[PDB]
Design a binder for this molecule. Structure first.
Ligand SMILES: [Mg+2]
Ligand SMILES: [Mg+2]
Ligand SMILES: [Mg+2]
Ligand SMILES: [Mg+2]
Ligand SMILES: [Mg+2]
Ligand SMILES: [Mg+2]
Ligand SMILES: [Mg+2]
Ligand SMILES: [Mg+2]
Ligand SMILES: [Mg+2]
Ligand SMILES: [Mg+2]
Ligand SMILES: [Mg+2]
Ligand SMILES: [Mg+2]
Ligand SMILES: [Mg+2]
Ligand SMILES: [Mg+2]
Ligand SMILES: [Mg+2]
Ligand SMILES: [Mg+2]
Ligand SMILES: [Mg+2]
Ligand SMILES: [Mg+2]
Ligand SMILES: [Mg+2]
Ligand SMILES: [Mg+2]
Ligand SMILES: [Mg+2]
Ligand SMILES: [Mg+2]
Ligand SMILES: [Mg+2]
Ligand SMILES: [Mg+2]
Ligand SMILES: [Mg+2]
Ligand SMILES: [Mg+2]
Ligand SMILES: [Mg+2]
Ligand SMILES: [Mg+2]
Ligand SMILES: [Mg+2]
Ligand SMILES: [Zn+2]
Ligand SMILES: [Zn+2]
Lengths: 93, 127, 97, 202, 214, 91, 25
RNA sequence: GGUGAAAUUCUUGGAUUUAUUGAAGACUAACUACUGCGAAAGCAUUUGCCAAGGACGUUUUCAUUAAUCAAGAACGAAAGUUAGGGGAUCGAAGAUGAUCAGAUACCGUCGUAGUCUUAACCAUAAACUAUGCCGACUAGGGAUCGGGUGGUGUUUUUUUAAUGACCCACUCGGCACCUUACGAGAAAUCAAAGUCUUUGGGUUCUGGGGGGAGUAUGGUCGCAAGGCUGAAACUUAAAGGAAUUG
C-alpha cells in the first residue's frame, strides 16, 4: 500500500512537470519531487580584512539552489528518515 | 591605494587552480597551482596542497611585484556541480595572510538557462 | 480591419468590379476610390492611377492578390480592381484610407 | 540538353553600339520571364542580379561564381548548387566563401556571383527506375554508359581481369604515384569502407 | 633564467571625464619593438572596474562596468565605455522566493550611431499593510509593465549620445522613472536596469573620441 | 469507384522495380504533374515540362524552379534570408 | 525472471516462431 | 584530466588556464510554490498575428434541445519506422581503461544510431488519483486561484479624490490541505472508498482460484517493430491482499 498521501511530492493537478537533474549523481528527477535546499555560504575571516584595502566594504557570498535525486539526498543530505507519523510533519527545522 | 591585477581562481574536486594577471587579462603573470607540490593524484584538491602551492603563487606575484587584486574565483560549473571546491578557499586563506590587500569580490561560475543536458543519463552514476 | 469596412459597402451601396467597368466609371468621374489587388500588373496599375489622377479619384492598394480581393467582396472569382460608386454607409471615403 | 538546371536568356544593350547582346546565364530558382536583371558593383541585393563578392554581406547565397575576377563564372553551376559567403578581408580585398563540396576557398572580392540558388534542384531525388531512363540521360551527355565491371574481363583488358572466380585478387586502393593503365579502383584512397557517423565540414 | 621581470614596461588608462575620478592604474602589454609592436595590437581590451571605485561611496557599489580601449600614443591608452553588468551577490540576493521577477530588454540606437540591447529587472513589493505572504500580481500587469518599461527605455537611449547616456543612468533615477508609471499598477520594489552589452561602432572617429578629457 | 488502393499514378509501372522505388517515384510524380497557382495572375495555370521550368497557361509567364516543384524548400529559405540581408542595407 | 524480461523473451520467441513457419507460407 | 583510488586520454601542437571574439544546434535556469491552464498526452524568455475556452456577471435569447454510451472517429509521453534537413549536446550499439575468480555491466573513455525539425507513419506507458460519467443528500476548519458584491477600511498626496495595489466580510466556481467521525472498510485508510442484508436515482465498462498465457489459432491494422481481437488440452491447493508479532 501507499506510504505517503502525496506518493511523491507536491504535485496534484498537472500530470507532468519537466524534471531537474540532481547535483550529486546527475540523475534526473521531477522538479516537484526533487528535494530542494538553497546553499547560501559566505567566502570565509579575520586577516582577510586587516592586510586589505576596503575595510570590509561588502562581504558577499555564494547563492545556489540544490536539488537531490532523493536517494543521494538520503545518502548524505537531510532526509534523516522519519517514523510513520513523524514523516507527515512538514516543519522545516 | 596601490597596484592591482586579477585573481582568476578555480576550484574542482581532485584539483585547484589560482592565477594572477593584468586587469585587461591580455598578459598572464604566474598561474600553476594544481598538483605542483602535491603528487598523489588524490591530494590535488587537498587544502594543505592548495596552500602549499598558493604560497609559490603569491611568491611570483610579488617576485615581479603587485600589491593586490580582487578575486574572480569560480567552480568548474557549466553542467558540473555548481559549487566551490575544497582547495578554493584554502588557497587565498594563506594568500590574503601573505601580506597582500584584497577588494571587490565576486563569483564568475558559469550557469546556463537549464540546457546542455548533463552526463550519466536519466539514471545518473550508479553506486 | 479594412476588409470589414468594404464588406459593408457590398451589402449597402453601389460598386463595380472589373478593369473595363471601373475605367468607364473613372472616365465618367462617378468613382470616388478604387482598390487594386497586389498581383495586378504594374502597367494596368499605373494606367488606372493615371485615370484616377484625371478624375481626381483616390486609390487604395489592397495588400493581397486579386483572389483575395474577390473573396473580400463576396464574389467567387478573382477581382483585379474594384471601384466604388456609392458607399451607402461605409466610412471608407472618410476613414484614414 | 544534357544539363539539369535551366538556362536564362537575358538581353542587354550595348553601351558602345546601338546593338543588343544576348548573354546566356544559368537560371537561379525564382527568376521569371520579363524580369529585370541588374549587374554591377553598385547593384541591389535582389535574387537574380549579379554583384561582386565584395558588394554583398556575409551569409549571402550566390551561384555561377568566378574563380578569378571576370572569368565569366566557374563555381556552383549544377542544378540546386550555390556557395555561401563566409567572410571578407577588405585588405588584399579577399572574400572567403564555402562551395557546394564543403571546402572553403578565398577569392578576390571583385569576383562575381549571382544572388540565389540554381534552378531545377532536387533532380537527383528521383530514382531512375530502369536502364532506359539512364540510357536516355547519358544519350545527351556522352558515351559513358553502361559500365562493364572490370572484374568481368580477362587480364588483358583490366587489372582486375581474370581468375577462375571473380575477385580483384589484390588491394583495390591505388597510389597517386600510379601510372596510366594502373589507376583503376580507389585512387589515393585515404580511407575506405562504409562511411559511418555524421559528417559535415568544420 | 629568462626572468620576464626584466621585460617590457607598464602603461596606464584613466576614465573619460564622464565621472569624478578617472585614474585607472596601469597595465603591461609589450615593449614597442618596431616589427610587430605595441602600436597596432593593444587597444583591444577591457577591464573590470566597479563604480564604487570609479566615483564614490558604496551607494553605487553594485554595477560592473567594461571599458573598451580605443586608442593609444605616448602616455596614452585612455579608454572609453564598452558596456556594463550587475554583480552576482546582489542579483542572487534580489531574487528571493515568494515574489515574481520581471525582466525586459530592447535594442535601440543613439544619435551617436550605436545601437544596443538594454536590460531591466523589477520585482514585487508587498504593501506594508498586507497579510498574504506571496505578494503576486497577475500577468496583465507583467505585460503592461514590460510594455511601459520598453516605452520609457526606448525614449531615453535615442534622445541622446552615448556620453550623455552614461550621465543619465549613473544617477540611477532611471530606476524610479519606471516606478512613476508602475505606481499606478503594482508596488514594484527593487527596480534596476541590471545590464548593457553591444555589437559595434562607426569607424573610430579619433577626433570625436578625444572630446572627453581636459 | 476507387480504382487503386495505393499505386495511384504509379500503376503504369506494374509490379516491377519494388514498392520503395515506386512509392518514392510517385511522390515527385504528383509534384511535377499537378497544376500550381501563378503568382503574377492568381490562376492555377502553371505546369512543368523541362524540369526547372514552370509556365502559366494564360498570361504566358515562365519561372525557373525546382526539378519537380515551382519552389524548393532551399529556394524559399533563401528568399527569406535575402530579404532580411537586403532590408539591412537601406536603414 | 523480471516481467518485461519475460516479455522480450516471448516477443523474440514469437518472431522466431513466425519466421520458422513463413518458410511453409 | 577523471575517480573511492587509479588507468585508457590530451600536453613544443603551448595544452588545463586568460583575453578579445565568431559559428552551430539544443534548452529556458534562478523567479517555481502543496500556484495556473488543457479532454488527456501535456504546457514556463519577448513580442505581433490566428482562431479558440472555463469560472464569474446577467430581470438577454431558445425552450427539454438532455445523461451515459456497443459500432465508429479526433487527439495521444518516450522510444521506434519512411523522405529530406540538422546533427551543438548527452548518448542503446560497438570498441576500449580499470575492477572481479569471472565482469559482455555498474565507474572511466571514444562514439554510431538517436537526441532537434519538416512531411508521413506507429497508437503503446506504473498514459496513476492503480479510484467511470451526469444528479441529489450527509461535517467542521483555516489557507489559497479566478469572477463578483459590499466600504464615512489602511496606502499612493497632487490638493483630496479618480484610480492602482492592500485589509476585512460575504457569495459562485478551481487546485489542495487540516480536524473529526456520524458512517464505511479485511485493514491500510476514505467527505467518499459515505447516504447497502433497513440491500433499487440514470447510464457505460471490466472481473469470477492460481498457472498454462495475453501463449495457440483465425480475423484485422502496420513498411516493420508490432497494436486490437483472443482460446484450449493439461496441470495445481493454493497464489494473493491489508495488518501483528518476531
Ligand atoms: Mg512497500
Ligand atoms: Mg509526479
Ligand atoms: Mg502522466
Ligand atoms: Mg561522455
Ligand atoms: Mg547506493
Ligand atoms: Mg556504350
Ligand atoms: Mg557500376
Ligand atoms: Mg556494371
Ligand atoms: Mg569472362
Ligand atoms: Mg594486367
Ligand atoms: Mg596489380
Ligand atoms: Mg581477377
Ligand atoms: Mg566478386
Ligand atoms: Mg516458477
Ligand atoms: Mg522456402
Ligand atoms: Mg527564463
Ligand atoms: Mg549526433
Ligand atoms: Mg559495450
Ligand atoms: Mg575488460
Ligand atoms: Mg555487450
Ligand atoms: Mg494499456
Ligand atoms: Mg501516480
Ligand atoms: Mg481523492
Ligand atoms: Mg490489481
Ligand atoms: Mg489500466
Ligand atoms: Mg467543507
Ligand atoms: Mg471594492
Ligand atoms: Mg477509526
Ligand atoms: Mg470505524
Ligand atoms: Zn543524485
Ligand atoms: Zn499567370
Amino acid at each position: 500500500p501507499k506510504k505517503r498521501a502525496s506518493n511523491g511530492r507536491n504535485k496534484k493537478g498537472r500530470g507532468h512537470v519537466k524534471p531537474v537533474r540532481c547535483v550529486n549523481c546527475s540523475k534526473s528527477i521531477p522538479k516537484d519531487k526533487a528535494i530542494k535546499r538553497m546553499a547560501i555560504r559566505n567566502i570565509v575571516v579575520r586577516d582577510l580584512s586587516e592586510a586589505s584595502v576596503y575595510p570590509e566594504y561588502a562581504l558577499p557570498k555564494t547563492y545556489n539552489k540544490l536539488h537531490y535525486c532523493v536517494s543521494c539526498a538520503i545518502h548524505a543530505r537531510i532526509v534523516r528518515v522519519r517514523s510513520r507519523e513523524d514523516r507527515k510533519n512538514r516543519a522545516p527545522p | 591605494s596601490q597596484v592591482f591585477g586579477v585573481a582568476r581562481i578555480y576550484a574542482s574536486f581532485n584539483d585547484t587552480f589560482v592565477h594572477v594577471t593584468d586587469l585587461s587579462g591580455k598578459e598572464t603573470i604566474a598561474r600553476v597551482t594544481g598538483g605542483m607540490k602535491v603528487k598523489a593524484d588524490r591530494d590535488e584538491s587537498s587544502p594543505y596542497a592548495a596552500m602549499l602551492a598558493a604560497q609559490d603563487v603569491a611568491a611570483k606575484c610579488k617576485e615581479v611585484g603587485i600589491t593586490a587584486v580582487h578575486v574572480k574565483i569560480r567552480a568548474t560549473g557549466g553542467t558540473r556541480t555548481k559549487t566551490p571546491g575544497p582547495g578554493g578557499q584554502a588557497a587565498l586563506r594563506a594568500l590574503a595572510r601573505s601580506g597582500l590587500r584584497i577588494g571587490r569580490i565576486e563569483d564568475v561560475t558559469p550557469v546556463p538557462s537549464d540546457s546542455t543536458r548533463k552526463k550519466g543519463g536519466r539514471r545518473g552514476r550508479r553506486l | 480591419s479594412i476588409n470589414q469596412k468594404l464588406a459593408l459597402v457590398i451589402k449597402s451601396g453601389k460598386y463595380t468590379l472589373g478593369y473595363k467597368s471601373t475605367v468607364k466609371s473613372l472616365r465618367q468621374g462617378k468613382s470616388k476610390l478604387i482598390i487594386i489587388a497586389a498581383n495586378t500588373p504594374v502597367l494596368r496599375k499605373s494606367e488606372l492611377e493615371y485615370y484616377a489622377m484625371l478624375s481626381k479619384t483616390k486609390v487604395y492598394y489592397f495588400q493581397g492578390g486579386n483572389n483575395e480581393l474577390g473573396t473580400a467582396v463576396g464574389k467567387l472569382f478573382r477581382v483585379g480592381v474594384v471601384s466604388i460608386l456609392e458607399a451607402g454607409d461605409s466610412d471608407i471615403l472618410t476613414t484614414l484610407a | 540538353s544534357g544539363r539539369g538546371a535551366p538556362l536564362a536568356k537575358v538581353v542587354f544593350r550595348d553601351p558602345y553600339k546601338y546593338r543588343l547582346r544576348e548573354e546566356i546565364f544559368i537560371a537561379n530558382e525564382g527568376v521569371h520571364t520579363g524580369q529585370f536583371i541588374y549587374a554591377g558593383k553598385k547593384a541591389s541585393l535582389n535574387v537574380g542580379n549579379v554583384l561582386p563578392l565584395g558588394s554583398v554581406p556575409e551569409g549571402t547565397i550566390v551561384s555561377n561564381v568566378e574563380e578569378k575576377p571576370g572569368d565569366r563564372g566557374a563555381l556552383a553551376r549544377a542544378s540546386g548548387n550555390y556557395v555561401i559567403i563566409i567572410g571578407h578581408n577588405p585588405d588584399e580585398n579577399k572574400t572567403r566563401v564555402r562551395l557546394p563540396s564543403g571546402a572553403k576557398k578565398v577569392i578576390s572580392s571583385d569576383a562575381r556571383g549571382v544572388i540565389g540558388v540554381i534552378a531545377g534542384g532536387g533532380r537527383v531525388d528521383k530514382p531512375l527506375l530502369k536502364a532506359g531512363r539512364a540510357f536516355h540521360k547519358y544519350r545527351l551527355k556522352r558515351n559513358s554508359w553502361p559500365k562493364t565491371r572490370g572484374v568481368a574481363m580477362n587480364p588483358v583488358d583490366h587489372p582486375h581481369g581474370g581468375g577462375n572466380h571473380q575477385h580483384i585478387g589484390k588491394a583495390s586502393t591505388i597510389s597517386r604515384g600510379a601510372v596510366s593503365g594502373q589507376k583503376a579502383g580507389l585512387i589515393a584512397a585515404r580511407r575506405t569502407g562504409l562511411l559511418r557517423g555524421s559528417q559535415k565540414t568544420q | 633564467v629568462v626572468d620576464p621581470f626584466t621585460r617590457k614596461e607598464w602603461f596606464d588608462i584613466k576614465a573619460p571625464s564622464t565621472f569624478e575620478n578617472r585614474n585607472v592604474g596601469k597595465t603591461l602589454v609589450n615593449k614597442s619593438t618596431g616589427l610587430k609592436s605595441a602600436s597596432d595590437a593593444l587597444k583591444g581590451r577591457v577591464v573590470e572596474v566597479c563604480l564604487a571605485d570609479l566615483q564614490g561611496s558604496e551607494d553605487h557599489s553594485f554595477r560592473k562596468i567594461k571599458l573598451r580601449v580605443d586608442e593609444v600614443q605616448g602616455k596614452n591608452l585612455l579608454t572609453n565605455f564598452h558596456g556594463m553588468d550587475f554583480t552576482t551577490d546582489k542579483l542572487r540576493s534580489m531574487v528571493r522566493k515568494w515574489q515574481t521577477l520581471i525582466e525586459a530588454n530592447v535594442t535601440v540606437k543613439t544619435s551617436d550611431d550605436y545601437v544596443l540591447r538594454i536590460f531591466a529587472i523589477a520585482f514585487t513589493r508587498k504593501q506594508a499593510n498586507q497579510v498574504k505572504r506571496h505578494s503576486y500580481a497577475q500577468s496583465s500587469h507583467i505585460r503592461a509593465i514590460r510594455k511601459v518599461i520598453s516605452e520609457i527605455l526606448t525614449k531615453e537611449v535615442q534622445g541622446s549620445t552615448l556620453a550623455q547616456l552614461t550621465s543619465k543612468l549613473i544617477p540611477e533615477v532611471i530606476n524610479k522613472e519606471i516606478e512613476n508609471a508602475t505606481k499606478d499598477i503594482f508596488p514594484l520594489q527593487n527596480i534596476h536596469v541590471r545590464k548593457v552589452k553591444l555589437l559595434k561602432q562607426p569607424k573610430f572617429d579619433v577626433g570625436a573620441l578625444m572630446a572627453l578629457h581636459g | 469507384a476507387k480504382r487503386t488502393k495505393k499505386v495511384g499514378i504509379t500503376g503504369k509501372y506494374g509490379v516491377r522495380y519494388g514498392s520503395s522505388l515506386r512509392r518514392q517515384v510517385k511522390k515527385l510524380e504528383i509534384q511535377q504533374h499537378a497544376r500550381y497557382d501563378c503568382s503574377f495572375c492568381g490562376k492555377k495555370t502553371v505546369k512543368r515540362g523541362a524540369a526547372g521550368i514552370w509556365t502559366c497557361s494564360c498570361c504566358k509567364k515562365t519561372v525557373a524552379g525546382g526539378a519537380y516543384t515551382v519552389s524548393t524548400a532551399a529556394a524559399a529559405t533563401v528568399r527569406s534570408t535575402i530579404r532580411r540581408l537586403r532590408e539591412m542595407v537601406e536603414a | 525472471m523480471r516481467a518485461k524480461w519475460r516479455k522480450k523473451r516471448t516477443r523474440r520467441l514469437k518472431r522466431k516462431r513466425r519466421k520458422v513457419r513463413a518458410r511453409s507460407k
